mmCIF file of C-alpha atoms in Angstrom:
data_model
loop_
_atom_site.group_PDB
_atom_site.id
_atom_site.type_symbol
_atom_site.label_atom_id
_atom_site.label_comp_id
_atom_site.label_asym_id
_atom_site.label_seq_id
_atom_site.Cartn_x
_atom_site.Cartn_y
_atom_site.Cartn_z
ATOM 1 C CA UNK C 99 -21.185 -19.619 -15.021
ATOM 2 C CA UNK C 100 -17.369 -17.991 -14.282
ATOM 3 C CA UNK C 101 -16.791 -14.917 -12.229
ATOM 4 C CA UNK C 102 -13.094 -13.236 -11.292
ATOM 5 C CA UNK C 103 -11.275 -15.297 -13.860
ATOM 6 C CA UNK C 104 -7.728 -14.515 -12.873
ATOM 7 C CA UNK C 105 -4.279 -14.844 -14.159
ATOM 8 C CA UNK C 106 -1.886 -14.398 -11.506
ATOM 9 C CA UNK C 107 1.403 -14.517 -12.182
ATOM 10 C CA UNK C 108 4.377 -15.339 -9.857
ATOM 11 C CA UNK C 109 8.068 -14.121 -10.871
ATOM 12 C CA UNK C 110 10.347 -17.038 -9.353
ATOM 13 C CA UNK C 111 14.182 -18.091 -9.048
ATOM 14 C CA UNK C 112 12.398 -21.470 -10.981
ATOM 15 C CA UNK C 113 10.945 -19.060 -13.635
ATOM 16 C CA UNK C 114 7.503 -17.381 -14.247
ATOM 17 C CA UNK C 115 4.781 -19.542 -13.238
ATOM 18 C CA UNK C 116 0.779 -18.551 -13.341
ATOM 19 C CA UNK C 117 -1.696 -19.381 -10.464
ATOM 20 C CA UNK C 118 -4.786 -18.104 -11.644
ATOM 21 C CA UNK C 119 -7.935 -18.330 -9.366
ATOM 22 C CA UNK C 120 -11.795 -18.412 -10.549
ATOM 23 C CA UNK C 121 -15.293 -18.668 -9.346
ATOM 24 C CA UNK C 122 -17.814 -21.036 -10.762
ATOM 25 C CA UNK C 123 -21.435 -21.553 -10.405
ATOM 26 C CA UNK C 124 -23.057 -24.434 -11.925
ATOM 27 C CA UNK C 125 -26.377 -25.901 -12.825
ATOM 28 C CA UNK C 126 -28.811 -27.914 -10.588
ATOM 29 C CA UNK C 127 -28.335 -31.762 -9.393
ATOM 30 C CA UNK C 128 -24.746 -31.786 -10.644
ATOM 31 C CA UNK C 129 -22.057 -32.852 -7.799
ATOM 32 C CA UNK C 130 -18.510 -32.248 -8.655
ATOM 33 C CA UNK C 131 -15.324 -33.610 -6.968
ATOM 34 C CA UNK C 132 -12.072 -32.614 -5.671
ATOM 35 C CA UNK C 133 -9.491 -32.134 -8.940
ATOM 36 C CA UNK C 134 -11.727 -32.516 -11.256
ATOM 37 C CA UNK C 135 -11.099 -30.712 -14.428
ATOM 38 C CA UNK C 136 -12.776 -27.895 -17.223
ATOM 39 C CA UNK C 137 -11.855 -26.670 -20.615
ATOM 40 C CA UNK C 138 -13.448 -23.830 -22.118
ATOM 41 C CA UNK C 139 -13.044 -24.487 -26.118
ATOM 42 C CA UNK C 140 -14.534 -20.906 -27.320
ATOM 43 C CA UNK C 141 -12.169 -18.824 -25.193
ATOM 44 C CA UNK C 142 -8.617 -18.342 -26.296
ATOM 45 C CA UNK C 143 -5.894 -17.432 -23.389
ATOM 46 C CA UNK C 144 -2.427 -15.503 -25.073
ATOM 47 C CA UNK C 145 1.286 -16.899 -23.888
ATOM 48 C CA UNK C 146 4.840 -16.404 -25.206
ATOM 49 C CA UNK N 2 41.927 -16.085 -14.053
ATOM 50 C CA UNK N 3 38.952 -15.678 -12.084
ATOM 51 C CA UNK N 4 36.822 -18.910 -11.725
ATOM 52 C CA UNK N 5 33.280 -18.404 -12.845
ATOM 53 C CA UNK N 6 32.069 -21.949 -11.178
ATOM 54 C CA UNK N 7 28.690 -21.455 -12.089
ATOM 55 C CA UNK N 8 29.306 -21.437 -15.842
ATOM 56 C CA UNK N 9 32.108 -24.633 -15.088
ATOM 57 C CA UNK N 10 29.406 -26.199 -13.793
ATOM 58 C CA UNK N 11 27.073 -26.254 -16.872
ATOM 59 C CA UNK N 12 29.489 -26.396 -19.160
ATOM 60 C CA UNK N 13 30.577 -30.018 -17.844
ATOM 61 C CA UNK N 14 26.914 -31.020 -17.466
ATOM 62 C CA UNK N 15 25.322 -30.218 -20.360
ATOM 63 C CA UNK N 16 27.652 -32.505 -23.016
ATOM 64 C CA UNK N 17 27.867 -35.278 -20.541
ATOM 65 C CA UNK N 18 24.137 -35.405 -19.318
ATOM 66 C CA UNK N 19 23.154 -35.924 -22.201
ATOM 67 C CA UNK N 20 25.710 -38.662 -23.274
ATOM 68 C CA UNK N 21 24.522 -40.800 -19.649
ATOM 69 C CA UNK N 22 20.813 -40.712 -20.895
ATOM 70 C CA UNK N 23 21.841 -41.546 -24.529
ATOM 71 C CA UNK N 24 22.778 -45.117 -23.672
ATOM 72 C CA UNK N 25 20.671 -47.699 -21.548
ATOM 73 C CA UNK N 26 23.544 -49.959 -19.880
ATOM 74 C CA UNK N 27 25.235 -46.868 -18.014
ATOM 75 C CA UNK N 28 21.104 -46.033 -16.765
ATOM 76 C CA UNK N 29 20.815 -49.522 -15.313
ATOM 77 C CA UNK N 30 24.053 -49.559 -13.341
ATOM 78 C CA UNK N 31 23.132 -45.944 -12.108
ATOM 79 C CA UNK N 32 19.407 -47.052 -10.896
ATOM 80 C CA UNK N 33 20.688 -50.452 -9.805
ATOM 81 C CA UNK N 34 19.457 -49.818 -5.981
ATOM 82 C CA UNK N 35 16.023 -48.015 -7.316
ATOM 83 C CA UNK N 36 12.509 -50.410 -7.415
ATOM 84 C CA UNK N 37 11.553 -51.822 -11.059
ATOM 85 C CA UNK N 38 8.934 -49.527 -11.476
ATOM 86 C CA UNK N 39 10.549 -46.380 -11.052
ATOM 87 C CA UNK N 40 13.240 -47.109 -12.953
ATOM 88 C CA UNK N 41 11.522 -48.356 -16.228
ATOM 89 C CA UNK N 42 9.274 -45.087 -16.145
ATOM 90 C CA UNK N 43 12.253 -43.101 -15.796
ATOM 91 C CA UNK N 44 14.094 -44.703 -18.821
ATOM 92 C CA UNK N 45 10.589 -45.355 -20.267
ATOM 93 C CA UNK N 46 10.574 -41.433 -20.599
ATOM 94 C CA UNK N 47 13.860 -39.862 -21.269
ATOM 95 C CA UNK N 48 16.608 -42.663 -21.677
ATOM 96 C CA UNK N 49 17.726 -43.125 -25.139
ATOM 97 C CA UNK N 50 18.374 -41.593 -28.334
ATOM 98 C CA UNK N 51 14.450 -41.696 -29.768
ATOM 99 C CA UNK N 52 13.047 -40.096 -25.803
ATOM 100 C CA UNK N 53 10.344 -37.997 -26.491
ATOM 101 C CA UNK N 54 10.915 -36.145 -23.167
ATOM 102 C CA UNK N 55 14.044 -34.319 -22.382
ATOM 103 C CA UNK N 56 15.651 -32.853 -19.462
ATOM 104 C CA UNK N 57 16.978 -29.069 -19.267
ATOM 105 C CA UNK N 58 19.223 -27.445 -17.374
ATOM 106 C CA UNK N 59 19.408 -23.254 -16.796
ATOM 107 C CA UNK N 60 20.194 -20.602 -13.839
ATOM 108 C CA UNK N 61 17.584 -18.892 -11.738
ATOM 109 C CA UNK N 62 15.668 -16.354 -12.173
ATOM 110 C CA UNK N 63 15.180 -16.914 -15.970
ATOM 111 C CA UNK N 64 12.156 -14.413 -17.460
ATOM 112 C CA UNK N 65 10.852 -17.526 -19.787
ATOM 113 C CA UNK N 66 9.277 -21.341 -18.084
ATOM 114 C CA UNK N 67 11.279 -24.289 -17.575
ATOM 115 C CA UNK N 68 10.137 -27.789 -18.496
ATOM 116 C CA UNK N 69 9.086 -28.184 -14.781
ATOM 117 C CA UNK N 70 8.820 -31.552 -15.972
ATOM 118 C CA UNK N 71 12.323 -32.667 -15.620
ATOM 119 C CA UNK N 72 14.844 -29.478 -14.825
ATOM 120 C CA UNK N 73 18.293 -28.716 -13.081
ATOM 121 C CA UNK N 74 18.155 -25.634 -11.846
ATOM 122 C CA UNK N 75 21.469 -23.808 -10.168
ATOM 123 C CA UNK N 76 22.015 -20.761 -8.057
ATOM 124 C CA UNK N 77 25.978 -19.206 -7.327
ATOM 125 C CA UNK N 78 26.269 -19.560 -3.299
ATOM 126 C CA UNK N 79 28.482 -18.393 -0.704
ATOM 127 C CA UNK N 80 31.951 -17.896 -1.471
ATOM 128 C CA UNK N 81 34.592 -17.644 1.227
ATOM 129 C CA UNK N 82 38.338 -16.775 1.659
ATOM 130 C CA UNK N 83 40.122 -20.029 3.545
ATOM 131 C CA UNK N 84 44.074 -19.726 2.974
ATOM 132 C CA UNK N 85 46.562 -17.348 1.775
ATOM 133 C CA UNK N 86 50.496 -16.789 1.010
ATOM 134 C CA UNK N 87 53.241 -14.753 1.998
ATOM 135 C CA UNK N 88 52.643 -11.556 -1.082
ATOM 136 C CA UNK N 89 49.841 -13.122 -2.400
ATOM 137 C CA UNK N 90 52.272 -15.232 -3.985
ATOM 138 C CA UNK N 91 51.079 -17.916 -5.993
ATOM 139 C CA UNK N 92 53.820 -19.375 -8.597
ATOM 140 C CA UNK N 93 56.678 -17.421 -11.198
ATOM 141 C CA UNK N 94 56.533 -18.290 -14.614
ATOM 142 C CA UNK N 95 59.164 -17.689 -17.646
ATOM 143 C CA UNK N 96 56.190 -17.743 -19.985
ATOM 144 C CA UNK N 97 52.855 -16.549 -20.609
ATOM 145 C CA UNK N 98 50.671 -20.100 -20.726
ATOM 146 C CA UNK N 99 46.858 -19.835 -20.671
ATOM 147 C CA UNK N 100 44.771 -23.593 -20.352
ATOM 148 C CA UNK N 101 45.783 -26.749 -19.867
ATOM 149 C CA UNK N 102 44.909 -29.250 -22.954
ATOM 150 C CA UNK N 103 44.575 -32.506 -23.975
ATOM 151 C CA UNK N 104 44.985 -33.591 -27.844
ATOM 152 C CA UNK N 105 45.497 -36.270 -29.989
ATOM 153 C CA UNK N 106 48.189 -36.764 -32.808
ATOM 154 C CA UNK N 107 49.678 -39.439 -35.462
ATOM 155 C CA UNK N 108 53.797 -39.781 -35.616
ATOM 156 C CA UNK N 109 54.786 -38.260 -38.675
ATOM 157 C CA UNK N 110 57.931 -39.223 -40.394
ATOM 158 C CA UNK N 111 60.928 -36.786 -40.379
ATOM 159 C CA UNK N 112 63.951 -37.657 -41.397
ATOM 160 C CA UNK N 113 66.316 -37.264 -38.368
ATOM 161 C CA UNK N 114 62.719 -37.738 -35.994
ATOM 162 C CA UNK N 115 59.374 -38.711 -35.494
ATOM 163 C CA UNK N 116 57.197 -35.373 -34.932
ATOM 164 C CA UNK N 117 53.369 -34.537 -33.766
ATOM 165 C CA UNK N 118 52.032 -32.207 -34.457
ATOM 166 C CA UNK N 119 49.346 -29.958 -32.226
ATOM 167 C CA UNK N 120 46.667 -27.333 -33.046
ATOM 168 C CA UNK N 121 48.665 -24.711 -31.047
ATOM 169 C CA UNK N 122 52.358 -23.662 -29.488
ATOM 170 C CA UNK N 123 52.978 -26.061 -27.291
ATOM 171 C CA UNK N 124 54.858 -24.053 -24.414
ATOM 172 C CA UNK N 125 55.250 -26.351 -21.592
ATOM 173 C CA UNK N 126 55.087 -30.017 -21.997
ATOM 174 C CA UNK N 127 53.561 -32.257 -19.402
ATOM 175 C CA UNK N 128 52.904 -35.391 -20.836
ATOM 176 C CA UNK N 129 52.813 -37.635 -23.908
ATOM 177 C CA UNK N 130 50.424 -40.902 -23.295
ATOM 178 C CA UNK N 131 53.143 -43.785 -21.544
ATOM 179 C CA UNK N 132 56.381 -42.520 -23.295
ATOM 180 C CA UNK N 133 59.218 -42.089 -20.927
ATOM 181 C CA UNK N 134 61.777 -40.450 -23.678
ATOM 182 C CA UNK N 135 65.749 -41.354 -22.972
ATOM 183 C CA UNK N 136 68.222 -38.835 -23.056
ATOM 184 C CA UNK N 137 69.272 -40.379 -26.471
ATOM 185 C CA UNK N 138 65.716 -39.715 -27.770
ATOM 186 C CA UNK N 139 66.272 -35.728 -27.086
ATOM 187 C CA UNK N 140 63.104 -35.057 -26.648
ATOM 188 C CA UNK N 141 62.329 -31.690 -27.668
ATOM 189 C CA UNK N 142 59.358 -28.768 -28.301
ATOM 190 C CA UNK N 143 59.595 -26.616 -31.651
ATOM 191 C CA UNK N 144 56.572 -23.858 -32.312
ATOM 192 C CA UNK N 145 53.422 -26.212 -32.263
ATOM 193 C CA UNK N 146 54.778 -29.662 -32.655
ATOM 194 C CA UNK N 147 56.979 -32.139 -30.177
ATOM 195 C CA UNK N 148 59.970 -34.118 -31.886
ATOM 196 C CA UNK N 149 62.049 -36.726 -30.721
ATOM 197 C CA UNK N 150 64.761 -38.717 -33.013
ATOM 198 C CA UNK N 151 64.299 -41.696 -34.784
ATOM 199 C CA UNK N 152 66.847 -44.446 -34.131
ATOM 200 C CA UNK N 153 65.687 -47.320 -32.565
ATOM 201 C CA UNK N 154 62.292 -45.584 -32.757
ATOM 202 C CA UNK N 155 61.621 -46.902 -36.120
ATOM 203 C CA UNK N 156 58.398 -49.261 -35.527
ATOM 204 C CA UNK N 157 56.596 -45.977 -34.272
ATOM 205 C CA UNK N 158 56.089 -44.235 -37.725
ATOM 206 C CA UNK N 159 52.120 -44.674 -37.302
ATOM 207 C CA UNK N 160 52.461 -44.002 -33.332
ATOM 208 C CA UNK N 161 48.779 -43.268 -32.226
ATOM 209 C CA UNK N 162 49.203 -40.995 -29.011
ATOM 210 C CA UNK N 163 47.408 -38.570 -26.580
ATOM 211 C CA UNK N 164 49.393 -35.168 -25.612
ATOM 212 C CA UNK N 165 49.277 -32.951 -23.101
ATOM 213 C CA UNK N 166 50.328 -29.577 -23.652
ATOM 214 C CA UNK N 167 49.896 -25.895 -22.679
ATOM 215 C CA UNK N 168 49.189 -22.795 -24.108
ATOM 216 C CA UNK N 169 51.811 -20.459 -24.634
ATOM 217 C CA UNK N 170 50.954 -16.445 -25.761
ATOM 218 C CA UNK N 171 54.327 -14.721 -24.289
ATOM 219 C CA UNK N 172 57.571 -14.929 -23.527
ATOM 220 C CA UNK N 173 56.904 -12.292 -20.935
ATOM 221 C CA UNK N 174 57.719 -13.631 -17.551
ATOM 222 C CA UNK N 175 55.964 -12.776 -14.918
ATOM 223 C CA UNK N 176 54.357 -13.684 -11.294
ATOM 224 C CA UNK N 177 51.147 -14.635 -9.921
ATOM 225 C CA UNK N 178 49.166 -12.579 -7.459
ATOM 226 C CA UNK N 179 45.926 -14.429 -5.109
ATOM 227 C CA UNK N 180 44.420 -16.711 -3.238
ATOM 228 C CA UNK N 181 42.301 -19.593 -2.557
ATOM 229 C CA UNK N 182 38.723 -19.623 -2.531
ATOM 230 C CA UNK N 183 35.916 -21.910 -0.773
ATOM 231 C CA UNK N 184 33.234 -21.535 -2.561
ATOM 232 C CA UNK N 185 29.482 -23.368 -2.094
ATOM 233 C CA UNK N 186 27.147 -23.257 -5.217
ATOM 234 C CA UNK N 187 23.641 -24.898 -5.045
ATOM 235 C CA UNK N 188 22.205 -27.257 -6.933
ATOM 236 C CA UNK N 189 18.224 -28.809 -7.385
ATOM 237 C CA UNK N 190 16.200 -31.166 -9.741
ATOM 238 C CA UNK N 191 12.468 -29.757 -10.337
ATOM 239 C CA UNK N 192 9.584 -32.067 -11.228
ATOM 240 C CA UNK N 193 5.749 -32.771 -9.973
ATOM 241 C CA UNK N 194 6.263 -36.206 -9.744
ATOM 242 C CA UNK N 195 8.655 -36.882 -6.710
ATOM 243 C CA UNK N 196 9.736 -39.836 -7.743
ATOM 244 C CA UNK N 197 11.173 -38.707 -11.142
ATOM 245 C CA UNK N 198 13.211 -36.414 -8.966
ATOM 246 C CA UNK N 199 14.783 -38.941 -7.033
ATOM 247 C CA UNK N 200 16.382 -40.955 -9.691
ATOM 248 C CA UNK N 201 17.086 -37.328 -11.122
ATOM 249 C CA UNK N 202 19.583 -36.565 -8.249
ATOM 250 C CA UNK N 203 20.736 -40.047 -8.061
ATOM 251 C CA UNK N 204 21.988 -39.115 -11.878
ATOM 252 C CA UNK N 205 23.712 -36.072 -11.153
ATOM 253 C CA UNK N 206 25.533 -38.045 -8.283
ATOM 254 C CA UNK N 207 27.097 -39.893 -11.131
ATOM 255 C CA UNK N 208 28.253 -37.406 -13.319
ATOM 256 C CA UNK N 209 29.814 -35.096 -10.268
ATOM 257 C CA UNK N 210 32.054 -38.526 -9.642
ATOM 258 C CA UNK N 211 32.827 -38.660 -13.595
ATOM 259 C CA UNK N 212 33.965 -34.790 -13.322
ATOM 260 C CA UNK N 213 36.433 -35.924 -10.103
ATOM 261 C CA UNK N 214 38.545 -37.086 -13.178
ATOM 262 C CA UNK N 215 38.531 -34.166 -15.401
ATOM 263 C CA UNK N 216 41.327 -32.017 -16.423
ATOM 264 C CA UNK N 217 39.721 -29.057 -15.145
ATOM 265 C CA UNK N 218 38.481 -30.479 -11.855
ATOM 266 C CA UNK N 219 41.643 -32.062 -11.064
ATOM 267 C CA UNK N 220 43.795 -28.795 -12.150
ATOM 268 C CA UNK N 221 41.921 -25.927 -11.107
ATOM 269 C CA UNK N 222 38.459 -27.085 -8.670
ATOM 270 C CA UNK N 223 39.641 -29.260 -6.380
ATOM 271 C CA UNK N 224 37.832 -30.778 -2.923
ATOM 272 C CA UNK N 225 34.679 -31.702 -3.486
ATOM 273 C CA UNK N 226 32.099 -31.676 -0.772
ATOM 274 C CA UNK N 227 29.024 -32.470 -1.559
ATOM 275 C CA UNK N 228 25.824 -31.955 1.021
ATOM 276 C CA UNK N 229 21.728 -33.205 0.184
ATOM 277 C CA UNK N 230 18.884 -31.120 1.479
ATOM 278 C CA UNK N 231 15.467 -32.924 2.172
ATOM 279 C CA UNK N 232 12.947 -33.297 -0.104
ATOM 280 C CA UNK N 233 10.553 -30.395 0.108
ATOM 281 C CA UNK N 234 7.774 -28.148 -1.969
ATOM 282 C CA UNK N 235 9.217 -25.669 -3.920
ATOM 283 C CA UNK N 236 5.884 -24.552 -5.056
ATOM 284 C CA UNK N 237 2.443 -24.945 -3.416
ATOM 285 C CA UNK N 238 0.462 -22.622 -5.495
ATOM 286 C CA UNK N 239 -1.110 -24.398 -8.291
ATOM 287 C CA UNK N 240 -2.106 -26.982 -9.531
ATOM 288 C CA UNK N 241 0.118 -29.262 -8.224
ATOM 289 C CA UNK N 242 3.306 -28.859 -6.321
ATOM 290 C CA UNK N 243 6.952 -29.018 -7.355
ATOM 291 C CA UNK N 244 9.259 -30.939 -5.571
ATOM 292 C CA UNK N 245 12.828 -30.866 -5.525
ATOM 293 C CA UNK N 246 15.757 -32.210 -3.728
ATOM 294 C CA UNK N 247 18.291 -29.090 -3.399
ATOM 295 C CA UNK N 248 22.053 -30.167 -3.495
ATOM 296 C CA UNK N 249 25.315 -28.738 -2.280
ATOM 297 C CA UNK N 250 28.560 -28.526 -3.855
ATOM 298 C CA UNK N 251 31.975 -26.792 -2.634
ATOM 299 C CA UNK N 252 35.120 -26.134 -4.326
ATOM 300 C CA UNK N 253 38.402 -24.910 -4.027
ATOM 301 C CA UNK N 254 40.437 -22.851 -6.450
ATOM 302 C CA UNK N 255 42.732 -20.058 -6.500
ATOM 303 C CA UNK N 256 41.443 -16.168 -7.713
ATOM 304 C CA UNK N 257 44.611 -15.046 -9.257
ATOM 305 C CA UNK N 258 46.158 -12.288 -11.504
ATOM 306 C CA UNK N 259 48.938 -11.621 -13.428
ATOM 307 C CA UNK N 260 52.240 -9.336 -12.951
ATOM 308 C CA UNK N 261 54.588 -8.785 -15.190
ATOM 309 C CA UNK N 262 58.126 -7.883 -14.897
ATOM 310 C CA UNK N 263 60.664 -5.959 -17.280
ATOM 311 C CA UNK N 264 63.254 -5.762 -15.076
ATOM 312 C CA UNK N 265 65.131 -8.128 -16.597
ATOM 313 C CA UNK N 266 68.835 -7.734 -16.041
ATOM 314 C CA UNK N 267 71.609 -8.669 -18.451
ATOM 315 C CA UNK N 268 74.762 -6.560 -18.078
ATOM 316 C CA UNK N 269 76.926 -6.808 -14.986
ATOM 317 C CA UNK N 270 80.208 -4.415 -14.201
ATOM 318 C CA UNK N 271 82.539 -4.467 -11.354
ATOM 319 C CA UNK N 272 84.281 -0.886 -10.699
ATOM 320 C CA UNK N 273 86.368 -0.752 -7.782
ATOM 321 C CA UNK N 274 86.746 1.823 -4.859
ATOM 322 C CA UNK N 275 89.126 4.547 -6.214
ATOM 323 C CA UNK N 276 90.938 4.671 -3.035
#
């Protein structure tokens, strides 16, 4: 489960860059670590 | 001619950048000091002609991404006035000359002189590659092409030479009106990996001692002072931070205009007192 997926967007000398933020709430006995990593096949995300 | 350093500055990196990571051998002696490792992933990724990975260069605050993989990013800087001259004065000239440039021409065979030929009026002469032309040569300029005679010239039909030459548009003298400028412009490699960055900078070093010998740099930005930054996080949020090494450079050139004169006097009459 996802809550508050967010695309934030930051306007920089470098360029644009994103920083989104989200909230996740998983199943039971599961123990994730630090930088560990999710894709979401189904949902498609826009870009130019 | 008003400098526009910032544009100078890509213009001279963006051919020869991409000439130093063409060839391996030039890499090497560049990334001589640098550890084994770091300097086969480097050349691993982007040295050569078949690299997969490239390296980009553009100004800041661009409305599009950057390949924050490998990027040289530059910002304008400070400018400051440092010296000046009585007027403004700068220099007179007899003709209106625009750049400074270097060509290359064959010896063609006239029949009082050996001739080159150039892709524009030649104006003012400065120098043809190790020729120093006698009196008895009479070396002179004609429209777009230098001449000089042919006697005791004769093994030179096929001369292969480099010339350098001038611009000319007018024949309207005129002076020059400015001063000199010190200005600072900033430069920075971007990359998440800070090693990558390192040998980055360590390659722009390079190619900043290559421009110390080009016709531009010696004629018209002059003084090079170079300053480092430390390393430090551009970015922090996301992902991953970007780290970057920001750089320093400072130049000095002249900001100057041009005046023209009519007042060109040609008659001369002496009247004396009627008394």
């Amino acid at each position: 489960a996802i809550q508050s997926q967010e695309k934030g967007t930051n306007q920089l000398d470098i360029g644009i860059l994103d920083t989104g933020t989200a909230i996740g709430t998983t199943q039971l006995e599961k123990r994730i670590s630090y930088r560990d990593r999710f894709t979401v096949p189904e949902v498609l995300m826009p870009q130019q | 001619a008003i400098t526009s350093v910032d544009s100078y500055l890509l213009s001279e990196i963006k051919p020869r950048l991409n000439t130093v990571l063409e060839n391996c051998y030039i890499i090497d002696e560049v990334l001589k000091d640098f550890d084994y490792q770091t300097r086969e992933s480097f050349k691993e990724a982007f040295c050569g002609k078949n690299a997969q990975h490239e390296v980009t260069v553009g100004f800041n605050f661009p409305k599009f991404k950057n390949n924050y993989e490998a990027h040289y990013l530059i910002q304008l800087g400070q400018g400051q006035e440092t010296k000046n001259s009585l007027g403004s004065i700068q220099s007179s000239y007899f003709e209106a000359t625009g750049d400074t440039l270097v060509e290359s021409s064959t010896a063609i065979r006239e029949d009082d002189k050996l001739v080159f030929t150039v892709s524009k009026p030649i104006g003012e002469l400065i120098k043809v590659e190790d020729i120093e032309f006698a009196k008895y040569d009479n070396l002179q300029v004609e429209g777009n092409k230098v001449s000089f005679k042919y006697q005791t010239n004769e093994d030179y039909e096929n001369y292969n030479a480099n010339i350098i030459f001038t611009e000319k548009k007018n024949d309207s003298k005129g002076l020059v009106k400015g001063f000199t400028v010190e200005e600072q412009v900033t430069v920075v490699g971007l990359s998440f990996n800070v090693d990558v960055a390192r040998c980055l900078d360590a390659v722009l070093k390079m190619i900043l001692i290559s421009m110390r010998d080009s016709i531009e740099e010696q004629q018209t930005f002059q003084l090079q002072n170079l300053s480092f930054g430390d390393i430090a996080p551009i970015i922090e949020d996301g992902d991953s931070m970007i780290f970057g090494r920001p750089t320093i450079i400072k130049y000095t050139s002249s900001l100057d205009l041009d005046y023209t004169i009519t007042q060109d006097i040609n008659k001369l009459t002496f009247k004396e007192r009627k008394d």
